Copies of this chain bind each other. A is one copy, B any other.
């Protein structure tokens, strides 16, 4: 009676931790939808002590997953950066690491039919409108977790997943092979192709796994 349950899963998506929710498990009204996300995350609060998020920007992001609204997509995906300090749910942009969780989650939730060795998943990003391509290793109707692929920022080794960003060209503007990078915590290669105005492939190897599934509670009285 004091609280309400919401189904909810938590993922490591690449170098991030995401909280994953199904479109229908959230309020239709945007005002209430935002209050409820803030309550799940434990925002606004520097410690995020009364909610699921872990007080770092890398561990305070949302993926809402729903039925595809695009004839060429298996699944719709809405990303949000949930502010730690402010009452703000920011829907501006795509998260490349978080989109690495989407495919495996879509398979494990039967939004996409599992095909052994490898399932191609096509993701419709809402914030952008653009399509992403995930190539997912599948074993027994579920996403493979184990294997020998190292990405920097995550201890140990996991099943590789290829993300294709090639149709991201246009992001905000509407206008536009393995190359290294010495980012904050190591190194990272990508399969770029530079040809003026068309992007052939922008593909990189990510990694993901499900950490938890269950129900978050959210206090009713705090939705005054």
By a beta-carbon cutoff of 8 Å, the part of chain A in contact with chain B is: 1-3, 5, 8, 10, 12, 15-17, 22-28, 42, 44-45, 47-56, 58-59, 65-67, 69, 74, 107-114, 116, 139-142, 144-146, 153-156, 159, 209-217, 219-222
Are A28's CB and B155's CB within 8 A? no
Please report the C-alpha to C-alpha distance between residue A34 and residue B195 in the assembled complex, in whole angstroms: 48
Q: Are B214 and A17 in contact (CB under 8 A)?
A: no
Contact B155 A45 (CB under 8 A): yes
Q: How distant is the Cα of A221 from the Cα of B159 in the complex, in angstroms?
A: 12
Q: Shortest distance in angstroms between A110's beta carbon and chain B's nearest beta carbon?
A: 4
- Tell me whether B214 and A8 are in contact (CB under 8 A): yes
Contact B25 A141 (CB under 8 A): yes
Some 19 contacts from A to B, beta carbons below 8 A apart, are A1-B142, A2-B145, A2-B146, A3-B209, A8-B214, A17-B49, A24-B108, A24-B114, A24-B142, A25-B110, A26-B141, A47-B58, A47-B59, A48-B54, A50-B155, A54-B56, A145-B219, A146-B221, A211-B217
* Alpha-carbon distance between A112 and B138 when the two chains are bound, in angstroms: 24
